[PDB]
Structure formats: C-alpha cells, structure tokens
Amino acid sequence: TSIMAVTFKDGVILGADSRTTTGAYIANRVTDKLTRVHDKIWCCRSGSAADTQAIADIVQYHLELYTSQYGTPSTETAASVFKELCYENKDNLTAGIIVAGYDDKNKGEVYTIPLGGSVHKLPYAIAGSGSTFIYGYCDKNFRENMSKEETVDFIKHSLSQAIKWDGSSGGVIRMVVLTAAGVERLIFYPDEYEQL
C-alpha cells in the first residue's frame, strides 16, 4: 500500500494506489483505498483491511450521529474519533490511518494515526509499505500553498515512485480532491504514471 494526503492552497488531496495482496498474490488490483467518513472528511487506510474497515465504518457512524445532533464535525473531531478507537484497542488492531478533511473555517487539514494510536497534525502525510521509498522525494519536493494542479502532480509523481519500488503497491492511482467547491474523484492509469 502507498497512501498519502497533502494540504494545498484551496484544500486537501488524498491519494492511493489500488493493490491489495495476500502474500505475493494480488487479491484485488483495483481497490478503492479512499474512504469517506463524512462529506468532506476522508481517510486512507493501511494495515489490516478487516481492522481499518471496521474502524472506518464505526467512525462514519459516530460522525453521522454527531452531525444529527451538533452539526458538521471538524476534521480534528474525526481524527479524534479514529484515535480513540485505535488507541483504546491497540492490542488487537493493526491499523494505520491518514485522516483528511475540509471545512470553511480551518481550510484543509491532515492528521496521521500510525500503529500505536498517536495523532499527528501535518502539512502532508505518507503511509503504507510503499511510503518508505519516498520519504526523500517527498521531503524535497513538497511546498506549502501549492495549486491544485501542482498538488495532483506531486501525489502522482510520489505514488508512481512508491509503486515502482514496492511490490505491495500498484494498479491505478486514485485521488480525492477536497475543497469549498466540493469533492472531486480522480484516477490515473499505469500508462500515464509509469512514463513519468
């Protein structure tokens, strides 16, 4: 798995590859790793697919109940619900989640919740087995307040490198763009990103 979320000028973009493996077998080559827990709060999942689906499904439930009672939740509130589940259940979960969202007040935000259930607010985050190969590339190429097109390029180039090196990553690159304008789903096929 190669997954990332990047804040930019107008909001936040989430990106992921589409490969799920059991051993060296590709159980699914077209997975959608980009998961909605609210209209403009999304996450990328890494680790146990059972665990991260069970968690995401519960967060989605909490945020729907939250919205019914108290209105729209902040990204911080979403991140906090994820952390609560991950921290309190650390002994039986293998879950690394990146949370990304947009609201009008706080703009674009990114939180990363690695294995032990700690929370980290960051301008951008990378995760999954494929992420290790792009720490250098991402740290050298990321700038704050990038445009939409620049950010889409950054994720595209980053994940293509992660896919190039990590056997557990691959397939298509999916993205979700999160802004005041709405929600935009993007896809990129191997024939485009391999030629980068």
């Binding site: 909490h62 939250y66 009672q69 108290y70 902040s74 509130t77 906090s80 619900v81």
Partner: protein, 237 residues
C-alpha cells in the same frame, strides 16, 4: 412523576416548580460577546463567612451555571454536567458546544420525569458560555424544558427581574458590552432583592466573555465587583 393528570399535566413537576419559586433569585444576561451570571445570597446570620459560600459553578472551563431552588439538586445537576462535558471532550476533542451541553442537561432532567421511583429536580438552572460560534444563554426548568434566552431570571425575585431584563432588550437592540452587562446584573439583583428586604444579602457575579476573559468562565472579584455594587447602590436610590 410518571403520572399524567386527566388533562395531560404532571402535578409532581408543577409542585417541583414551587420549590424553585421559593428559592433565592438568580439571573443571566447575554452580552455582545459573552454571558453574565448573578445571584442573590441571603445572609441568614453575621456568622456566615463573607464571599465563602460560592453558589455559581463552572463546568469545563468555558461554562457557568447558576440555579434557584433546592441547592443540592443543582449541585447534583452540575456534577452530571461535568461528567457529560468530560465525556464529550474525551471523544470529540473539542470543548462541548453550549447548545450541545444544554441538551445533555435537558435529557437528564427530563429522564427524572419518566419514572415512579424518582422525583423531578427542584431547581431551575441558568447557564451558558462562549463556543465556536458565539455566546449562548439558557434556562432549564424542572420539566426538562429549556430554550435560548437574551436574558433570564428565576426564583422569588423573578417577575421584577424579568421586567428589568425586558427593558434592556428594548433600549439596546444592537448588542451591549460585557462590562455594561456586569453592572446591569448587579442592578437587577438589587432591585429583585426588594421583596426580601427583611434579611440582608450578598451579591455574586461571574462572566464568560470572548474579549474580557478570553472565552473562559471567570468570577467577578475585587474592583470590578465593587464598581458594580456602587452602580447598583446608586441606581436603587
């Protein structure tokens, strides 16, 4: 309690309201960036230590609560509100919004009107504070009923207090500062005390203001209190 009268009333709750009416008068005033809370403390005897039987209570850091009626019932309600605010902050990280908190108390007070093995609360509670989107002031009756208020009063001096509050709403439709609202609270408590002029009283004021306390609940003490007392003493004569 769980008993409806032939015409849909709940006598037990109506009787609980009587305990409230019998109580010391307390008020709340909503200013342009916060809320002010004042309460009348009857001095039964010279032996009561001045300043040392604090009635107004904080919940979390940003909420004040005041009540009239059975004081212990009010404390019971504030304990619950504190558990309720902690539970919210634990899960959602953000401090509880005032409307969110209002309903928490409301549902709890309402639950005590469902079952034959329980009595309704013998208080009305005036509470509020500042959140993500401004000031809010609430009042909650023994039935669990609550609404947002521009200004609120309860207890024995309630009718005259409501009259003074209503005047302020008319003379200042364009908001009204935290510093003014404190002065005016001291005034209204003094005017409401008129009923009980046989026994002496002590004034308690607290406030939560975006600009004056940075959105935290804070007791009015020292010079600010004395200035408000002087204003009330002046305007009563």
């Amino acid at each position: 309690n769980s008993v409806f009268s032939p015409d849909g009333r709940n006598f037990q709750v109506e009787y609980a309201v009587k305990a409230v009416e019998n109580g010391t008068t307390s008020i709340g005033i909503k200013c342009n960036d916060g809320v002010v809370f004042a309460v009348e403390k009857l001095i039964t005897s010279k032996l009561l230590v001045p300043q040392k039987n604090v009635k107004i209570q904080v919940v979390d850091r940003h909420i004040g609560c005041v009540y009239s009626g059975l004081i212990p019932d009010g404390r019971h309600l504030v304990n619950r509100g504190r558990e309720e605010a902690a539970s919210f902050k634990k899960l959602y990280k953000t401090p509880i919004p005032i409307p969110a908190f209002a309903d928490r108390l409301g549902q709890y007070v309402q639950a005590h009107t469902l079952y034959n093995s329980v009595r309704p609360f013998g208080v009305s509670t005036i509470f509020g504070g500042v959140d993500k989107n401004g000031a809010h002031l609430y009042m909650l009756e023994p039935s669990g009923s609550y609404w947002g208020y521009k200004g609120a009063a309860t207890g024995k001096g309630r009718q005259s207090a409501k009259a003074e509050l209503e005047k302020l709403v008319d003379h200042h439709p364009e908001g009204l500062s935290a510093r003014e609202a404190v002065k005016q609270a001291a005034k209204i408590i003094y005017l409401a005390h008129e009923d009980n002029k046989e026994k002496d009283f002590e004034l308690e004021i607290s406030w939560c203001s975006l600009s004056e306390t940075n959105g935290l609940h804070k007791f009015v003490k020292g010079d600010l209190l004395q200035e408000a007392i002087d204003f009330a003493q002046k305007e009563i004569n």
